[PDB]
């Protein structure tokens, strides 16, 4: 139904919950199809027990070929599900750090500027960037772990992306000079953010 | 410590909980190695940016080589972890159905057999065989989802494995038929269950 497809998943359901549920639904559906084909294969096999060799091989080629078309569907579906999910996760992570940066800039320009609000907004921005850094490392680590050939294709891009994040954080930290008197009041807490709480981009 | 390795995990930790914990330990461990190398790479990169391309290209290949060794180690380690875990799940499923068969044979052979006991045992048994069947299909649907050539090669084994389960179930139900009055009695419940 087109209207349902327009509305999409409810707001209650997170991307992660919806992903798992769709993965699970395909998995059940595909287990049923595979099981039916396997049963037919078995049933043809039971009648043909004493068949001549080449007749038995033809019976096997018949079902192997059905299974192949099935396997390729299963994997095509999977790619589509996994690409849609990966694209959404990246967008969410991009949104979280950009909205947090927004919060930080709004707090800096407040009048009278409020140290606690600025500090809080900065903690939230630094976490969001760290979430992107960990996602970049973990996805690389995961592809290395289950698909080592795909991993070699990524290295340089991963390497570049981490430098990008690191510079951007430092350029953002630099925006504290927008309110240098708030900068000075916050100096010890900033050392604490970056190194005690380990929110710094080079931790 | 060898003695700790002998004892293995505590009994209160399931194989599943244990497996996820170990996978996550290794994951956090390997992300740090990779971050360490990536940062070394960035510093060498930066330090040598004004140098000749021959000096620079020789540098890139150096860390690429380093990471390739790292990818290999990560991949192999995940293989050993997945092998250990698959081997243990198959043993658990084996043990549950064999233990359940034992119960069904005992109750069946009791003097005299009692329909409530048999039928509880037969139910526990069937569930156990259904569990191995689900596992066999799900594993295969998963290799199909992820690795095409490996699915092509296990295809016939899975077929064979499913037939074996089916033959065991039929044989076990046929033992019930040895007692026609007990078989006919439980059969309505069984047929409900067998197609449940
Ligand atoms: O023994 C008893 O407990 C009791 O026995 C009697 O007293 C009673 O029975 S009776 O009345 O006498 O007949 C009864 O009270 C009880 O038995 C029955 O109830 C219990 C309790 O459940 S319930 O509350 O009633 O619902 C049942 O046991 C509990 O639930 C099962 C269950 O599967 O539902 C188990 O749940 C956990 O463990 C399983 C298996 O363990 S393990 O093999 O992993 O070590 C987990 O499934 C596996 O992992 C998932 C997974 O990771 O997602 C799946 O893996 C595949 O998919 C993933 C992708 O997913 S994801 O994106 O990563 O999330 C992929 O990465 C994997 O590679 C892929 N594997 S595959 O392709 O090779 O297949 C698969 O489902 C499993 O993978 S596998 O290892 O390869 O097979 C499951 O996820 C996990 N659930 S949990 O929520 O995370 O905890 C537990 O055994 C148990 O949980 S509990 O908390 O300890 O209670 C019992 O089954 C039932 N017996 S029965 O009804 O008679 O049959
Ligand atoms: O390689 C594949 O293509 C692949 C696809 C399939 O999904 C699956 O195949 S199958 O199962 O074999 O069939 C495999 O999935 C991989 C997955 O691709 C990979 N992602 S990665 O980016 O390459 O590293 C990895 O996934 C784990 C990641 O940590 C993360 O993925 S992410 O979507 O890219 O970010 C995601 O993390 C989930 C948490 O698991 C979830 N926690 S839960 O408790 O609610 O279940 C939640 O965490 C929140 C939450 O608010 C709270 O967590 S809690 O622990 O305290 O409860 C905390 O605040 O942290 C939050 C958070 O971490 O964000 O959501 C996150 C992220 O949300 S998101 O999914 O929307 O992005 O999933 C992890 C996971 O283990 O699933 O590993 C997968 C499986 O590992 S594998 O089997 O070894 O390959 O392969
Ligand atoms: Zn510092």
Residue numbers in the entry:
A (entry chain A): 292 to 494
B (entry chain B): 292 to 487
Give the exact sentences the study uses for this entry.
APP and its paralogues APP-like protein 1 (APLP1) and APP-like protein 2 (APLP2) contain the highly conserved heparan sulfate (HS) binding domain E2, which effects various (patho)physiological functions. Comparable to the E2 structures of other APP-family proteins, a coiled-coil-like fold is formed by helix αB (Gly302–Gln338) and the first half of helix αC (Lys344–Arg379). The C-terminal parts of helices αC (Val380–Leu399), αD (Ala406–Val437), αE (Pro439–Asp468) and αF (Pro471–Gly491) constitute a four-helix bundle.
The heparin–protein complex crystallized in space group P3121 with a very high solvent content of 77%. Refinement was performed to a resolution of 2.5 Å and resulted in good stereochemistry. In contrast to the apo form, the short N-terminal α-helix αA (Asp292–Phe298) is well defined in the electron-density map in this trigonal crystal form of the complex. The co-crystal structure contained an (APLP1 E2)2–(heparin)2 assembly and revealed two different heparin-binding modes of APLP1 E2. A second heparin chain is tightly and specifically bound with its nonreducing terminal Δ4UAp2S in the centre of the APLP1 E2 dimer. The longest heparin stretch of six sugar residues is exclusively associated with one APLP1 E2 protomer (chain b) and extends to a surface patch distant from the centre of the dimer. Only the register of the sugar moieties determines the fit to this surface patch, which thus seems to be compatible with the binding of continuous heparin chains in various sulfation states. Our structural data rather suggest specificity of APLP1 E2 for nonreducing ends of heparin and HS exposing terminal Δ4UAp2S and IdoAp2S, respectively.
